[PDB]
């Protein structure tokens, strides 16, 4: 592409791709191993209306 702003000139390259999932049945596994830190503070936040 070729598409300019602000004085500058952008060359936004693109490339389209494809995904054939050639598996009769399951072919991939997530294995949940370890636990890093909790994001939420397990605290008190009463909800209003």
């Amino acid at each position: 592409a070729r598409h300019e702003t602000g004085g500058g000139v952008n060359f936004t390259l693109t490339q389209p791709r494809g995904n054939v999932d050639l598996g009769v049945g399951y072919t991939a596994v997530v294995a949940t191993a370890t636990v890093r830190n909790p994001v939420t503070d397990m605290g008190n936040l009463p909800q209003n209306f």
Partner: protein
């Protein structure tokens, strides 16, 4: 438990092009991908590296609409993968013989050329595994969260 990774899913097709092998030449059936610390913990105690350097092909596959396939993309609007060989062998099956097990189409293709690639190898159960952590080759010093 790692055997339960390598047995919970059942293998898909045999593409005879890939040949991701060893220096010995045994083909690999699966690939693990972990983070950096869990790779280190599984190499100190739990598992044992077999081989250091694995043979990987270089080329890719051309799938081009040159030839008699080109006309069916324009007049018609769809395309067979290999119409020059699907269409060729629809004249001998009606005429000559019969078979239960054919010649698979990919097994008549060329063998690609391979080089030597440094990548660690792990044998869980009875089949090989490419094991690799991916926050140093890729996702190093960019603004991108590791997926």
């Amino acid at each position: 438990w790692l055997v339960d990774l390598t047995t919970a899913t059942q293998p898909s097709v045999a593409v005879p092009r890939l040949t991701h092998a060893d220096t010995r030449g045994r083909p690999v059936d699966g690939v693990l991908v972990t983070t950096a610390p869990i790779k280190q913990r599984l190499l100190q105690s739990f598992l044992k590296v077999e081989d250091t350097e694995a043979d990987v092909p270089v080329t890719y596959g051309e799938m081009v609409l040159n030839g008699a396939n080109l006309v069916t993309a324009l007049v018609m609007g769809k395309a067979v993968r290999s119409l020059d060989d699907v269409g060729r062998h629809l004249l001998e099956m009606q005429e000559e013989q019969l078979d239960l097990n054919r010649q698979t189409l990919d097994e008549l293709e060329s063998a690609p050329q391979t080089t030597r690639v440094r990548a660690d190898l792990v044998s869980i159960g009875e089949k090989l595994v490419f094991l690799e952590a991916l926050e140093k080759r890729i996702y190093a010093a960019t603004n991108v969260p590791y997926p």
